[PDB]
A paper describes a structure:
Burkholderia pseudomallei lethal factor 1 (BLF1) exhibits site-specific glutamine deamidase activity against the eukaryotic RNA helicase, eIF4A, thereby blocking mammalian protein synthesis. B. pseudomallei Burkholderia Lethal Factor 1 (BLF1) is a member of the CNF1-like deamidase toxin family which acts by targeting the site-specific deamidation of Gln339 of the eukaryotic initiation factor 4 A (eIF4A). eIF4A is a member of the DEAD-box superfamily and is an essential component in the translation initiation complex, supplying RNA helicase activity responsible for melting the secondary structures present in mRNA prior to translation. A mechanistic similarity between catalysis by the cysteine proteases and the glutamine deamidase activity of BLF1 and CNF1 has previously been suggested given the similar orientation of a Cys-His dyad in their respective active sites. Six of the conserved residues between these two toxins lie in their respective active sites, including a conserved L-S-G-C motif located on a short loop containing the putative cysteine nucleophile (BLF1: Cys94; CNF1: Cys866).
We determined the structures of two crystal forms (A and B) of the catalytically inactive BLF1 C94S mutant in complex with human eIF4A∆20, at 2.5 and 3.0 Å, respectively. These structures are closely related with BLF1 C94S binding between and forming interactions with, each of the N- and C-terminal RecA-like domains of eIF4A. Comparison of forms A and B further reveals a shift in the position of the target Gln339 in eIF4A with respect to the Cys/Ser-His pair in the BLF1 active site. Whilst in form A the orientation of Gln339 is consistent with the suggested involvement of these residues in the mechanism and the expected nucleophilic attack on the side-chain amide of Gln339 by Cys94, in form B it is not. We suggest that the orientation of Gln339 in form B represents a non-productive mode of binding and the following description will therefore focus on the interaction between BLF1 C94S and eIF4A seen in form A. A total surface area of 1900 Å2 is buried in the formation of the complex by the interaction of two patches of residues on the surface of BLF1 with opposing faces of the N- and C-terminal domains of eIF4A across a wide groove between the two domains of the helicase (14 and 28 residues of BLF1 with 14 and 20 residues on the domains of eIF4A, burying 700 and 1200 Å2 surface area, respectively). We note the involvement of numerous negatively charged residues in BLF1 (Glu22, Glu70, Asp108, Glu124, Glu127, and Asp128), as a dominant feature of its interaction with positively charged side chains of eIF4A (Arg110, Arg161, Arg316, Arg362, and Arg365).
Numbering used by the authors:
A (entry chain A): 3 to 211
B (entry chain B): 20 to 135, 144 to 147, 151 to 330, 336 to 406
The structure:
Amino acid sequence: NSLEAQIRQAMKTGSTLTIEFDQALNQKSPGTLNVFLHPANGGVRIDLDSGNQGEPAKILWLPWKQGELQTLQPGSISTVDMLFFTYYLSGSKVFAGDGGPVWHIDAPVEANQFWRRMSSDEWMEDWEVGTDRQVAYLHRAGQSDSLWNLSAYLEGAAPSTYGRDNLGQAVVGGIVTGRQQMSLYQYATTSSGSSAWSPLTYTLQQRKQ
Amino acid sequence: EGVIESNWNEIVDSFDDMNLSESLLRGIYAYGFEKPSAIQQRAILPCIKGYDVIAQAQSGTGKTATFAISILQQIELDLKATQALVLAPTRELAQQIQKVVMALGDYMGASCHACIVQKLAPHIIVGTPGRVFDMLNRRYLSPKYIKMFVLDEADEMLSRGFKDQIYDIFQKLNSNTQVVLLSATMPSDVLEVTKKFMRDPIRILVKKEELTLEGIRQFYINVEREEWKLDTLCDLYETLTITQAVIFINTRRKVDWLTEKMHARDFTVSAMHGDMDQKERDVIMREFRSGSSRVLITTDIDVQQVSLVINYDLPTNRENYIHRIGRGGRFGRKGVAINMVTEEDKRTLRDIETFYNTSIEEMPLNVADLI
């Protein structure tokens, strides 16, 4: 019945339920944020407005920011069943470390560049060269490799992708399942409309440098 | 580069006339230390007096002596507890602070540990927010005698997702805790931290241009006459490989005109303008992000990547020029912009590089092998 339960349900069952976000959210730093969920079309809008049949919620939010990387810290991932959202992916990428941070990287930010900015993070400094981490990585299909291919830095399965020919949008979300533990989900929006939610999987990746 | 704006006038340019203690100065002169920046020159004094301070200092201030001095001058050297707490966004920045603080600190007998185990109560603790919150949480550190809370590079920390940890740490500190926030950037949420945590603080800000043209290749085409623009626009789709484009138009009337002619040439298009509410824009942005439309045509935008931006009409002023093609942030400094120029534009603006205050070069023939 509650909009929060329905999203959680749609993600687990692999059903179609679209999410709309107020640009105002991107003014809120990565972290635990109180929002209001409102019915909009057959989906759900997320904003900071209490009216229009707005149901409060406490979610893990991760904004988008032009010319930058935004990061969600693992220490924020703790309340079981809490939802997690990041702003619309319309070229940008999302990199997630299992037991680690979630990074929303602006689209034109080069892979070499964001890798260097990511490595500054505590969790990355502990990821010893020659060992593995579980990583969930998502980029737009057909996008230039300069913006996402990390093959010089990691050995492991290829990243997941969204769209085709560098066209399309994605919405990434999650459900916290434990301490520094989260199940990730995605759905795409292309000229064919919106797909259902599907798991965003973590693969094993070895750090090469 | 920029200009200082303060609500407080109390400048000092020397270590000599800061009213410091003797052991501190022994440390200062011992290690030839640098002069403080203009920002620092006006923060240091109220800061020593224990007031709340917001200082828009450049990144890396943590390496400097003035930074260290602002912390060491306040420490009761005979109380064997943690009196100052510095939060930095990364290990290297915390270590740099620890290094200069402990260098000066040694002459004074002050202690400084960087949280990045068993040994842990130094006067000053510097470290990463999560790590530091954890230590307070597991009680390896005490907020009991902490009277100063420094947030070095608050912007970087909020960007790196430590807002939560920062708010949780604050809740554990005494009501009378001096807060000193340093941030090169002052976006909305950083301002919120200060509103939430500070009482009538000293403000030393720097008005800084948020959108920039840096790294955006800017071209112009002498279209000469208005009526040759449509053809010029169609030829660009045969010269270049364009995935998605944004075309800026000056009037609602022309927006509608161009989307009709464009649609007649089998372009998928989304038209947007000022006489539309937010719910109607949302559906239109939804269709562009999804790629259902390959062309967005608007007047004076929420999308992360496009092949280029076309100024079909030249914007009425520089502000508009920057809102149209300028980008925020330090990275992903790339972009392509094409301006269409008529004789009337040239006769009105005289010289577009000067009018829009940027470098715009005539679009060459080999343009595809350049962007």
